[PDB]
Amino acid sequence: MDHRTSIAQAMVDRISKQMDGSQPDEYFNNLYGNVSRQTYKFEEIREFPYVAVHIGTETGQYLPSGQQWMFLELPILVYDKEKTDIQEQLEKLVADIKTVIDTGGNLEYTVSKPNGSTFPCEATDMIITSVSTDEGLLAPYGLAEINVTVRYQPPRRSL
Amino acid sequence: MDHRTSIAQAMVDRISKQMDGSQPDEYFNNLYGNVSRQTYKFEEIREFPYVAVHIGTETGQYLPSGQQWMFLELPILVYDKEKTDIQEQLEKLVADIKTVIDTGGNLEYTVSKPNGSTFPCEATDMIITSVSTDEGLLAPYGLAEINVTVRYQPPRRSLRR
Amino acid sequence: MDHRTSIAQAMVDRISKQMDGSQPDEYFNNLYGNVSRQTYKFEEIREFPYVAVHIGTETGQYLPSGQQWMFLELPILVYDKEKTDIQEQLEKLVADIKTVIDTGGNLEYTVSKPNGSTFPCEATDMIITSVSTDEGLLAPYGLAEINVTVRYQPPRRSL
Amino acid sequence: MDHRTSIAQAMVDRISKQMDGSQPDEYFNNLYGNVSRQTYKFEEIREFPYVAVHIGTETGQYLPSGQQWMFLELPILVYDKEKTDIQEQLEKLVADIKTVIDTGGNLEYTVSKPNGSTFPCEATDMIITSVSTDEGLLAPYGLAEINVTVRYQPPRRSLRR
Amino acid sequence: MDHRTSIAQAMVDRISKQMDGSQPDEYFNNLYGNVSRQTYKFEEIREFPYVAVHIGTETGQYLPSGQQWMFLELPILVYDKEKTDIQEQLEKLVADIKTVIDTGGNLEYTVSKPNGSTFPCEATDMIITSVSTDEGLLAPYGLAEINVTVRYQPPRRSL
Amino acid sequence: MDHRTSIAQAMVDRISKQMDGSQPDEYFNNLYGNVSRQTYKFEEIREFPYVAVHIGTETGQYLPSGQQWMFLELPILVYDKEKTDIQEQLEKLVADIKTVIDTGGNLEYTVSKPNGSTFPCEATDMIITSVSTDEGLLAPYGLAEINVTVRYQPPRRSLRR
């Protein structure tokens, strides 16, 4: 079950394919594509407007029919330079990412069955929690903290 | 969406346009114009009676009709020199800040649609929560932390995919 | 609104004129007058029995008719030498200050209108919370914390 | 009003009068007389079987008849020096202090009116909270914290201005 | 009242009489005798299978009939020195101690009257709450925290 | 009672017997044999895809019929080296552990009676609570914490003294 890096990769792929050089209205970042999950922390990232996805703690609760609900959290960070203005561009980026999370359907989902093929599925819901922002320190750079929760039912049932 | 920084910019513009060299009754600081969000912290600020607006964490919940309720927290700080007295001038400056934050209408918006023009919008309600004051240290200067919350309805960018 | 240094100065003035060299009954500290708000901390204060008023966190809540009720906090400190005994004199100090808090009316108050004159007003109610003291350290001196709350409605209404 | 120092003084006087070489039954410490609130901390105190009553933070609430309920906290500390066992004698002394605080009447006062005489008053009730015990370190010495709280009705110095 | 070191000594005597060289099969420890309250911390204890009793914080409640209830806590520690496996022998010891606490009756008790004789009494109930285990550090030795509560009404009533 | 080490040993025995070179469908990490409670921490463990079962604090309550409810916690940690990807391999291993927790039967015991034989018993239910992983530091290595709770009814060694 779990399928956590699957969630992360699905979100990254969705964001990349919905932001890359298309639909200039309703989306304003013009990312050639930089979003990923392998490279983060701060070191590396020599390119900017770069958005990284973290993978955090998840909590599960049991239903008495084999059903599984798994509340899982993806911390999100955004780094910006003074293209125009740090606060302005940062809010532009966070509005863009929140829009791409909310306005479009549910995530395509790319589980890997043991010694088989991928059975595409979906993720139930999205809830976006508190949104934070960097402080005055580190003036030329910027940070934007996003807390989003995902809940999915893994394609299995108990005994 | 979000409109955060747009909210802060509209609020600071309202402050500047409302407490500058006009209507000296019920409002007296005669700021040539100082308040902004671009420059803050403490370094710089050669001018005083300088009130600054910061950007804080949001909080959100979903209502089952496409509308989402979000609380914006704007911790705004007050800096002032000695003059006649730190306490009296500080409190009356924050009193002016609160009377302009409450008495005069609601907010305005100058939000920008993606690669388009700015369509005005509105902020639903504003509540000013706990307000603090600094201590004796740094005597000729002084801090005055006042925390405000903004309840705004973002444009419902659902049902239109 | 706010109007807090006026609250502090009103409390200081009330204590001073209600405790200075008059009514030997009820009150006895014979404070010729030391109480203030400009000078505190500990450094300076060469005179004793001195009582100082602090400035604390405020709290506000809204009523849906323009009415504003503002919870306020004034920590109070008292510093004493050995006239007879630290505990005894510090304690009848805190007793006298609590009595001047409680027994006499509401505040006579000195709010200041912008570019106008003072419209004397009233403060609704006062609640005295925990009263603390110091530790055995600093034997020749003494400290005693007082936590009071000023509950007032600012003389203004919303739109 | 408050009277917390007078409460401490009356309680220590009761301890001294009720432990000193009298009532050999039901009471076993034979304090010739040691207990006080004047000298405490640890430094000094060349005598032992010593018990010291600290006077601490309080709590209060308001009732709509002029009467005020005050919760006073009196941290009580005890000390011992071997002479058979730390644990047995510490238990013995804390048991004696607990039976004094419990089974013997109510609490007397010796409060002083403004520039007048002393009119006796009483404490409404006593309640004893957790009683801690120190650890092994400082082997020949020992501590056992006793947290007691009293509820007293102070003289209702309202309605008579 | 209080009667705390008497609780500790009664527990120690009970464990000694129900562990030593007799009643095997009921519980497993062939402990000749090591349990005590005078010697603890870690230093001393040259021998192993040591079990120690601590004396901890108690809480009391007052009933409006002179009745007295006292919620008292006795942390318990057990030490071991292999001869097989740390986890195996440690759970062996904790099972032994939980059995000796639970299976047999209430506590026989040896409270001491003022300048008189001992009036044996009873302890109402025992509840054993969370049981802990040490960390991998200090491999040749072992630790396991035992937390129990004893309920006793002291043989006296109020006025 | 307790059974903590016995529960852990039976759990890890089920892990090793179910992971090794069999049923490649639905289950693939191919632990030849490795995981146990004897060796853990980090020092040693030259072999990876290694998962450790620790023994943690428990919780208990009493019900008025002699039966004891004991809530026991097993912190489980996952270690993995880079083969194709740290994230993919760590996720798949934790998924395999979780499906061992869920889809396979109940938990067996091998508890030994005092100076007697081993009569097997069962575990009531398994609940797997929050599970977490490490961060970027120690890049070629990885950590994945698993917190699992086991509810067991210990043999009612009451009413038969």
Numbering used by the authors:
A (entry chain B), C (entry chain F), E (entry chain D): 1 to 159
B (entry chain A), D (entry chain E), F (entry chain C): 1 to 161
Question: What's written in the study?
Answer:
Bacteriophage T5, a representative member of the T5-like family of siphophages, serves as an excellent model for studying the assembly, infection, cell wall perforation, and DNA ejection mechanisms of this phage family. In this study, we used cryo-electron microscopy (cryo-EM) to determine the structures of mature T5 (a laboratory-adapted, fiberless T5 mutant) and urea-treated empty T5 (lacking the tip complex) at near-atomic resolutions. The T5 head comprises 775 copies of MCP gp8, arranged into 11 pentons and 120 hexons, forming an icosahedral shell with a triangle number (T) of 13. The T5 tail, which comprises 40 trimeric rings of the TTP and a distal tip complex, is connected to a unique five-fold vertex of the head by the connector complex.
We built atomic models for the portal, adaptor, and tail terminator of urea-treated empty T5. In contrast to the mature T5, the DNA and TMP are ejected in urea-treated empty T5, resulting in an empty head and an unoccupied tail tube. The tail terminator comprises six copies of protein p142. Each p142 contains two α-helices and a β-barrel structure facing the lumen of the tube, which are homologous to the terminator proteins of other phages, such as Lambda (gpU) and SPP1 (gp17). Structural comparisons of the portal, adaptor, and tail terminator proteins before and after DNA release indicated that no discernible conformational changes had occurred in these regions during infection. In the mature state, the negative electrostatic potential inside the connector channel and TMP collectively prevent the release of DNA. In the DNA-ejected state, once the interaction of the tail tip complex or baseplate with the host cell induces the release of TMP, the large space of the connector complex enables the passage of DNA. Therefore, the connector complex may not be directly involved in the aforementioned processes. Notably, the tip complex of the empty particle became detached for urea-treatment-induced reasons.
